[PDB]
Specification:
Elements lengths: L2 E6 L2 E6 L5 E2 L2 H12 L4 E2 L6 E2 L2 H12 L4 E3 L5 E2 L2 H12 L10 E3 L14
Antiparallel strand pairs: 1-2, 2-3, 4-5, 6-7, 6-8
This protein binds zinc ion (ZN) (3 copies).
One zinc ion (ZN) binds next to α3.
The chain binds a DNA duplex (19 and 18 nucleotides) through α1, α2 and α3.
Protein name: Transcriptional regulator Kaiso
Organism: Homo sapiens (Human)
Subcellular location: Nucleus; Cytoplasm
DNA sequence: GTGTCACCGCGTCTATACG
DNA sequence: GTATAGACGCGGTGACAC
């Protein structure tokens, strides 16, 4: 439980006492600070292998599962994550997923128990 | 030098606290 | 019912591992 604040013309920043990275949101600092702290543990439910960040465990765990939640809408081809989905659409369809319109679908996560977004 | 993926702003979910 | 906290899922780019 420590960090320090830094104020530049209005904007407040939060600096990590250990490694001194900056953060616009205290939330993000707390989440990061664990890398040092290890106050919380996020063990994989499939191997004895532990993560310092919830989300780090999640992508690891979807990986065990093989679920392919990202679907290219141009051709139906599915993918395990954003990164591979985006490489596909860019290199095969010469389009940018972040650009302007929806080129993919992100299916709800069905293969394990995580939070489920009412918009997904 | 540069292509890949770790990192963090952002937002939306759940939980506690009302009165 | 709203308010505020705490947790963490998601995108997607630029820092840095190769
Ligand atoms: Zn740090
Ligand atoms: Zn595992
Ligand atoms: Zn496609």
């Amino acid at each position: 439980d420590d960090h320090y604040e830094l104020i530049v013309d209005g904007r407040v920043y939060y600096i990590c006492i250990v490694c001194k990275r900056s953060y616009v949101c205290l939330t993000s600092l707390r989440r990061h600070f664990n890398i040092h702290s290890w106050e919380k543990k996020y063990p994989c439910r499939y191997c004895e292998k532990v993560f310092p960040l919830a989300e780090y465990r999640t992508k690891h765990e979807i990986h065990h599962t093989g679920e392919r939640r990202y679907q290219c809408l141009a051709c139906g081809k599915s993918f395990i994550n954003y990164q591979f989905m985006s490489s596909h659409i860019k290199s095969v369809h010469s389009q940018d997923p972040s650009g302007d319109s929806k080129l993919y679908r992100l299916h709800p996560c069905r293969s394990l128990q995580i939070r489920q977004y009412a918009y997904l």
